[PDB]
Amino acid sequence: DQLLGVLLEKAPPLSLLSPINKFQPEGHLNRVARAALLSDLKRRVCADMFFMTRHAREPRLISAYLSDMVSCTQPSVMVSRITHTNTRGRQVDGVL
Amino acid sequence: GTYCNTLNFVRFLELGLSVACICTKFPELAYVRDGVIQFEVQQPMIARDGPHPVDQPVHNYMVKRIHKRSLSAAFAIASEALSLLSNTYVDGTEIDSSLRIRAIQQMARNLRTVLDSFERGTA
Amino acid sequence: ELAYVRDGVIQFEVQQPMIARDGPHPVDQPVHNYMVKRIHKRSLSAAF
Amino acid sequence: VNTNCNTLDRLLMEAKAVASQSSTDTEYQFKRPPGSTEMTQDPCGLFQ
Amino acid sequence: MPHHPHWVNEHLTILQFIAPSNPRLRFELNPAFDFFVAPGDVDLPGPQ
Amino acid sequence: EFVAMPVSTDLQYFRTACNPRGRASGMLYMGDRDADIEAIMFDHTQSDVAYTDRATLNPWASQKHSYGDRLYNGTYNLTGASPIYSPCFKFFTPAE
Amino acid sequence: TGFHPGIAFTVVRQDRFATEQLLYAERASESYFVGQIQVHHHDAIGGVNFTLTQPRAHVDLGVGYTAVCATAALRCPLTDMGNTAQNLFFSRGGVPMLHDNVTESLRRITASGGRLNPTEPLPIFGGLRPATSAGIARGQASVC
Amino acid sequence: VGDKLVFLEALERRVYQATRVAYPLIGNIDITFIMPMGVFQANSMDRYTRHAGDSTVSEQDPRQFPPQGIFFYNKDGILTQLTLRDAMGTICHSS
Amino acid sequence: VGDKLVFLEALERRVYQATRVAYPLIGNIDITFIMPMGVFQANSMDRYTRHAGDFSTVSEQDPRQFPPQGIFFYNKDGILTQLTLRDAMGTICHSS
């Protein structure tokens, strides 16, 4: 149970920080940024709510695109040892 | 399960990104100061007769110019340079194998990532 | 001897990767990150 | 407005654009200051 | 009369009342006990 | 909670992202001082540029220290001992 | 207070949208020249540095449109409508005549607001340098 | 894609990783648009009434007439109000 | 799942079952709501009507122009009830 408690420290606003990793500002503006960040955050939390998957009827026809979009992650910078590779050439990505 | 390998080590001569370009070398590379070019493409004509006036082949030559880019790359460090240039030997003593090995390791490790970053930026 | 060992040797050397591009760029200086591996321990207890 | 080359060169030079006269992207919305250049495209700006 | 009249105008509805008025709006804080300014050493009724 | 409201209501301000009094406040305040929660509305001598159409949503309580800092506060001990909702004074105490 | 004017004051609409491109190449649609990198000695304030300088020559076919990019794709709206009107105060009017006191009273009446005063007076022979903004942690919008 | 084959690759895990630099191949567009107003016919005779009556034909209804301010839409999709008390300084006194 | 290969299993059926202690990692999530009951119009085009005989469930003198007394909140299946005076008859006499 203690080993499973890493979520509370492994769950920052990653979903919210993902777009900023590629859409970092490069100009010089503060008033418009202040006026627009609230709207951006409210639209993000409106479109990222669980109601979409709660009311969804066809998973693969509704939430599959969103799951594929949010399933993109970057590999770690530390190279591990030789993992258990399949005889047919299949690699292991992770666990869930 | 756990090893000692940080970041990622990649190269450019074996990546294979350049698949539709021919590599060329020119050790005697200097200022070109632009220049002139000339091209010749054979364009077939047409043959017709009647009320319309006859047509004759014509040749048109157009000259153009070229643009030369600029490359800039520099860093900012003083402690490493001072340490490297503070010895200047004394009178012809030994090579100081320990210090030489440490310098060869550190400078090469820094230069590898420096050149990797420079190549990535230029690409 | 896990009660008091204070490690002793570790390969904690991580730099900040940056693009070495000149021209219209500001002035900056790279910094080193000194991470730690100290996690607080919290557990319950029971008896019978 | 006046042309100085053939149709191909005219369309090639009209397919591009130069920096606008706006104050980058700030909220001041002033004239272009000397010392800031950016690549922008303004298609069909002369068509009104 | 020391200066121009303060709030003798009666043609203010929302913005004509909230934009220019400030001394007359600072005295209105809560709808329980209003406040007003007056010179010191003034009796009711005062002297000549 | 049972809180009174002024007779002047701002339906547009209420509908626009239901902003909680004044301006878009919270944690995204990176300025020159920590006393910007009232300077931006007490500077006066000019009617701003951008909006010029909303001074205060509820002037009965949004003006200086009138109601939010005088009803229960939370630092006078005796006044803060009332059995009220615990996560309700966070919007009135700047803290550190 | 009296006759309602019929004139209006509209706002110009401009959009600045950016979308990802899709570069197209061919067998000989792109080429570059590789030579020898020159080494130049550089001097620093506390040590010795090195600078790299080498001209680059690019040659293209120049016969048509071979490198076809992508059109406007689908992306999140990065343009926000922000009004920044009332910029006439920076010009202080014009036509200098015997109207200084009247125009000063008019400007005082029109600028005697009660919300916020970042900048307003702008006296003669004044610079009015912009204030210091935040760092590099902000959003993106537009004005009109 | 039929009788032709293309050469595509996805090289993204080796570039633009942990770098605080501006994204390249970004092109800003510039489109000029106007917002004309003043919808009012010369003759007020081409009008009728709807079948439903569940009323907007009152003599004191300012909706059928242009307002004092300017009504323009924004990104949020709502209609804002802008009075002329600040824009009155647009008098053409340069004559 | 998607374009990757990751583990997909549930461990909740093998640990902490048929026991007094429930599943751990159960936090408290609360969402705030606003239900205003005061309506304040601005224009003079909200107190007039042509006819009030759409439905025959009311009398001819329908008092639809009067402001509403309150807002009926839903209750499970939906019950139109309003009980606020009996709970907050006096709460501002001493405060004022």
Automatic annotation (TrEMBL), chain F:
Signal peptide, first to last residue: none
Name of the protein this chain belongs to: ORF40
Organism (species): Varicella-zoster virus (strain Oka vaccine)
Origin organism lineage: Viruses, Duplodnaviria, Heunggongvirae, Peploviricota, Herviviricetes
Gene from which the chain derives: ORF40
Included stretch of the parent chain: 1205 to 1300 of 1396
